[PDB]
Enzyme design. Structure first.
Site, short mmCIF file in Angstrom:
data_model
loop_
_atom_site.label_atom_id
_atom_site.label_comp_id
_atom_site.label_asym_id
_atom_site.label_seq_id
_atom_site.Cartn_x
_atom_site.Cartn_y
_atom_site.Cartn_z
N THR B 35 0.78 -1.18 0.00
CA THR B 35 0.00 0.00 0.00
C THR B 35 0.85 1.28 0.00
O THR B 35 0.53 2.25 -0.71
CB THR B 35 -0.96 -0.02 1.18
OG1 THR B 35 -1.56 -1.32 1.36
CG2 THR B 35 -2.09 0.98 1.01
N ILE B 36 1.94 1.28 0.79
CA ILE B 36 2.83 2.43 0.93
C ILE B 36 3.57 2.69 -0.37
O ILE B 36 3.74 3.85 -0.75
CB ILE B 36 3.83 2.20 2.15
CG1 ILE B 36 3.03 2.41 3.47
CG2 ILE B 36 5.02 3.07 2.05
CD1 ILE B 36 3.56 1.60 4.74
N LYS B 63 -5.92 -2.02 -1.17
CA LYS B 63 -6.95 -1.82 -0.14
C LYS B 63 -8.17 -1.03 -0.69
O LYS B 63 -8.58 -0.04 -0.10
CB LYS B 63 -6.36 -1.15 1.14
CG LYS B 63 -5.17 -1.91 1.82
CD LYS B 63 -4.89 -1.40 3.25
CE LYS B 63 -3.48 -1.83 3.83
NZ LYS B 63 -3.29 -3.26 3.56
N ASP B 66 -13.75 1.50 -2.57
CA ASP B 66 -14.83 2.08 -3.40
C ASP B 66 -14.33 2.12 -4.82
O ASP B 66 -13.13 1.96 -5.04
CB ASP B 66 -15.17 3.47 -2.89
CG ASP B 66 -16.44 4.05 -3.51
OD1 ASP B 66 -17.32 3.29 -4.00
OD2 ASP B 66 -16.59 5.26 -3.54
N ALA B 67 -15.24 2.34 -5.78
CA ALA B 67 -14.89 2.36 -7.20
C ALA B 67 -14.10 1.14 -7.59
O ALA B 67 -13.04 1.23 -8.24
CB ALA B 67 -14.15 3.65 -7.55
N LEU B 71 -10.63 1.06 -9.89
CA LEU B 71 -9.35 0.78 -9.20
C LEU B 71 -8.76 -0.60 -9.52
O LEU B 71 -7.56 -0.72 -9.81
CB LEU B 71 -9.52 0.99 -7.70
CG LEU B 71 -9.45 2.43 -7.22
CD1 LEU B 71 -9.80 2.58 -5.74
CD2 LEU B 71 -8.07 3.03 -7.50
N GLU B 111 -9.29 -7.94 2.59
CA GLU B 111 -8.52 -7.68 3.75
C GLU B 111 -9.42 -7.61 4.99
O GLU B 111 -10.28 -6.71 5.09
CB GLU B 111 -7.80 -6.38 3.64
CG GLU B 111 -6.94 -6.18 4.89
CD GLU B 111 -6.36 -4.82 4.91
OE1 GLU B 111 -5.35 -4.60 4.17
OE2 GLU B 111 -6.93 -3.97 5.64
N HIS B 135 -5.48 -9.81 8.81
CA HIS B 135 -4.54 -8.69 8.63
C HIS B 135 -4.52 -7.90 9.92
O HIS B 135 -5.37 -7.04 10.12
CB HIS B 135 -5.04 -7.81 7.41
CG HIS B 135 -4.07 -6.76 6.95
ND1 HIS B 135 -3.81 -5.62 7.70
CD2 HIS B 135 -3.32 -6.64 5.81
CE1 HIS B 135 -2.91 -4.88 7.06
NE2 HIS B 135 -2.61 -5.47 5.91
N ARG B 138 -0.65 -2.83 12.15
CA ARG B 138 0.61 -2.46 12.84
C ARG B 138 0.42 -1.38 13.89
O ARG B 138 1.26 -1.20 14.79
CB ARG B 138 1.71 -2.05 11.87
CG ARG B 138 1.59 -0.74 11.26
CD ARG B 138 2.87 -0.34 10.60
NE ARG B 138 3.20 -1.20 9.47
CZ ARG B 138 4.23 -0.98 8.67
NH1 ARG B 138 5.09 -0.01 8.93
NH2 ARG B 138 4.42 -1.78 7.63
O1 LIG Z 1 -19.03 13.15 -6.93
P1 LIG Z 1 -18.33 11.84 -7.19
O2 LIG Z 1 -17.93 11.49 -8.60
O3 LIG Z 1 -19.00 10.65 -6.55
O4 LIG Z 1 -16.87 11.99 -6.45
C1 LIG Z 1 -16.75 12.31 -5.07
C2 LIG Z 1 -16.54 11.05 -4.28
O5 LIG Z 1 -16.40 11.52 -2.94
C3 LIG Z 1 -15.31 10.28 -4.73
O6 LIG Z 1 -14.15 11.09 -4.68
C4 LIG Z 1 -15.10 9.03 -3.81
O7 LIG Z 1 -14.25 9.37 -2.68
C5 LIG Z 1 -14.61 7.84 -4.63
O8 LIG Z 1 -14.15 6.76 -3.77
O1 LIG Z 2 5.23 -7.64 8.08
P1 LIG Z 2 4.79 -6.18 8.01
O2 LIG Z 2 5.94 -5.23 8.05
O3 LIG Z 2 3.71 -5.91 9.05
O4 LIG Z 2 4.14 -5.99 6.53
C1 LIG Z 2 3.08 -6.78 6.04
C2 LIG Z 2 1.69 -6.14 6.21
O5 LIG Z 2 0.70 -7.06 5.74
C3 LIG Z 2 1.68 -4.76 5.55
O6 LIG Z 2 1.97 -4.88 4.14
C4 LIG Z 2 0.28 -4.11 5.76
O7 LIG Z 2 -0.57 -4.49 4.67
C5 LIG Z 2 0.42 -2.61 5.84
O8 LIG Z 2 -0.91 -2.04 5.83
MG LIG Z 3 0.39 -4.90 2.79
#
Ligand SMILES: O=P(O)(O)OC[C@H](O)[C@@H](O)[C@H](O)CO
Ligand SMILES: O=P(O)(O)OC[C@H](O)[C@@H](O)[C@H](O)CO
Ligand SMILES: [Mg+2]
Ligand SMILES: [Mg+2]
Lengths: 213, 214
Positions: B35-36, B63, B66-67, B71, B111, B135, B138
């Site tokens: 994610t990072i 993670k 939405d959408a 995504l 997750e 999960h 941390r």
């Molecule tokens: O007006 P919309 O297109 O729905 O967009 C705003 C939403 O908050 C969008 O940014 C949302 O956070 C998508 O996950």
């Molecule tokens: O072993 P760590 O350093 O905890 O990393 C694994 C985790 O699953 C990490 O990727 C987590 O998803 C961060 O949100």
């Molecule tokens: Mg992770």
């Protein structure tokens, strides 16, 4: 004062976002780096958009779920003003993001999605969280309309001392539903970006808000 | 039947990630774009790592909240094999992400963190989701939260329901024996590999311990 207007840049690339910002950046109060843009481009999107629009509030819609200190710091080092943390994060994720935010004179919003409780909402206030986003999912909406249960929830959050943002497929015609409630921010993504005239769309939102509030 | 090993690349930039992968890409089964890293570099991280290691499973830990279609498609277009959707997402977010995944011969994991229910779990199974990530946060772990019988019970119950369960979140080598006798699909190690004196030996130790315990 009046509810502020936020544009969601749910775009995959910077150049796609700029197609919108070049029309409407001066027509809004807050520029959001949408989650889609965060994932598309990474935090450079935050850095680039704040550099372009330093006089606007820049919200990084990162939807932080874990590693609150690390991810908030990355956003705030990229000059974000505000970041989002998802409501199902551990409370210590929220607290960690808030501690960092305070170093940068920024702020954290909790994104309210699906299941959350009033006991959690009280946890957030006790932690010093003062913003929540009442966030209707587009995937629910693609299947869910606005209603009195939403209005009831929004008023209760406001009463608890949150500054409440309203969003999720918002249309101009929806605004009157929230009359009388001290809404902090209305977000429009699609309903601005995808309008025949984005400039007209933003101005209609600001006009309606001014009239209703 | 041996639990597989996944490395989490929770690095801020690609070059930091590559300091790890150049050592351990062939010592682990799954390469996670953490994610990072997704937030640091965007989805180019997925495309670039898959190009380096096209024979490996590449997991984008996005993670998705939405959408789900938009995504997931971005991740899959970037040649991800698997993507993560957080459990507090709308069920249609998970469904939408799965539909896209299936176009790309990929898969979606849920997750599992904080509050979720066995009703939700049935919903995920009913939608055709076959993987969940147990999960541990941390940030709770930083607050002193440890593996116990509640976790074991839940993991066995998810496994029985038909999910392949991944276990993660500050996993240390000494934690593995707690899970003996459970058909764990995948163990994820991030920090305990990346930050070791020898990431190669850290990965190898995880692999030897797993081969012994299972
Ligand atoms: O007006 P919309 O297109 O729905 O967009 C705003 C939403 O908050 C969008 O940014 C949302 O956070 C998508 O996950
Ligand atoms: O072993 P760590 O350093 O905890 O990393 C694994 C985790 O699953 C990490 O990727 C987590 O998803 C961060 O949100
Ligand atoms: Mg992770
Ligand atoms: Mg958004």
């Amino acid at each position: 004062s009046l509810p502020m207007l936020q544009v969601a840049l749910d775009n995959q690339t910077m150049d796609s976002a700029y197609e919108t910002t070049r029309l409407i950046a001066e027509e809004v109060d807050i520029i959001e780096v949408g989650t889609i843009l965060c994932v598309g481009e990474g935090v450079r999107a935050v850095r680039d958009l704040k550099a372009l629009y330093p006089h606007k509030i820049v919200l990084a819609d990162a939807k932080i779920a874990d590693a609150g200190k690390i991810l908030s710091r990355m956003c705030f080092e990229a000059n974000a003003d505000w970041v989002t943390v998802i409501c199902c994060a551990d409370i210590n994720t929220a607290k960690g993001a808030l501690d960092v935010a305070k170093e940068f004179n920024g702020d954290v919003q909790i994104e309210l999605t699906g299941y959350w409780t009033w006991e959690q909402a009280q946890q957030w206030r006790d932690a010093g969280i003062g913003q929540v986003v009442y966030h209707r999912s587009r995937d629910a909406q693609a299947a869910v309309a606005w209603g009195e249960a939403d209005i009831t929830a929004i008023k209760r959050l406001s009463d608890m001392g949150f500054k409440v943002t309203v969003t999720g497929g918002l249309a101009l015609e929806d605004l009157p539903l929230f009359k009388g409630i001290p809404i902090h921010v209305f977000i429009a993504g699609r309903s601005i970006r995808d309008a025949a005239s984005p400039v007209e769309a933003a101005r209609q939102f600001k006009r309606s808000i001014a009239e209703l509030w």
